[PDB]
Symmetry: D2
């Protein structure tokens, strides 16, 4: 509920389906610890990554496996992945939607931040 990932395909004009997403959180020792992972549905959305209880203050990295996505469609893309890094919940709990728009040599990422 508090963290949602949405992925679109700018070549097909469709949701980007079956995109792997890995979420990390910066530990006290300054390393990235595994936080959550999943894959986008037929709507291009990934719900259920985390809960309000687990999604504490921190620096999060959302790694979107754009390379595996493009290669499964028989295409050779430029990027290894799309990485989104942000501080979460510094002024109290929020809801974060990370949107990504994918092309083989280009991506954009947008954060929609709402107060529940």
């Amino acid at each position: 509920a508090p963290l949602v990932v949405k992925v679109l395909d700018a070549v097909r004009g469709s949701p980007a389906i079956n995109v792997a997403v890995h979420v990390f959180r910066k530990a006290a020792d300054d390393t990235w610890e595994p936080f959550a992972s999943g894959k986008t549905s037929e709507s291009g959305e990934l719900h259920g990554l985390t809960t309000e209880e687990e999604f504490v203050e921190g620096i999060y990295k959302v790694e979107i496996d754009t390379k595996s996505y493009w290669k499964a469609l028989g295409i050779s893309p430029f990027h290894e992945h799309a990485e989104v890094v942000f501080t979460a919940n510094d002024s109290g709990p929020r809801r974060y939607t990370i949107a990504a728009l994918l092309s083989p040599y280009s991506y954009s990422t947008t954060a929609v931040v709402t107060n529940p």
Copy 2:
């Protein structure tokens, strides 16, 4: 010199070459008057569209023929074209670079306005 157009291809990661661009100026009766046109170069850029003396304040439209570009590469596009509409404002010395990043079902346009 005061108006430049740059077009990139997000699918091939390249300049968008030989893309037709038409510039219109809005006339007093609200119609679009042809003003300038050309084809992007091997660098995806279109220089020499106009001059300081000709590029007066007003509303301009830059139409980029994205549909023809995608058809020439064998790729199915969504838009008829990309239309960028803006007011040229004299407020001190200015150069307008209109940049467009093209995908079959998406484009982005950005104005880089420098002194």
Copy 3:
């Protein structure tokens, strides 16, 4: 239902609320005729522009009044509007979502086309 407009604000990371949207359709005489209009809700979405019956084959222009949006937030933007022009329903009826991401000197537009 067949045509939906979604608008985001890249400065605030929020839906772009109260954005005026004018839809035109190219007439037989090659002029733009008024087709539909509305404004984005608190979610940044505009539903109810048209019906499956009215939304026939044609060339449509979706004009998003980005200038009025930015000026209402006391900001002077570059563009007059964001214009999206496309051929609709050439291979039969589809559902079109036109998404726009707005910044004062930049916008992006994405079409998501689905088969109902």
Copy 4:
């Protein structure tokens, strides 16, 4: 010469000036080894990062310090930075231009790969 970074500001419609950029190369043990760095120029560009002889095939990360850029302009940003990660592949003569278009809650990156 073979790797160039260009950064634009979507809020002010300008080159993104004095933006710190760090380039890392992935080492055999999967860590990120410092490779190159600099500050974008008055044109939003960072030239001279590396040479043909030094820029071998491998996985590179380009980190753009977007958070510092927005703070210096008095604007509240979302991301800690913009990270662009890619494999450099020799397949014939190539120049990589990494372009980034920055907004407070959004960025776009594009690779322009030319001969």
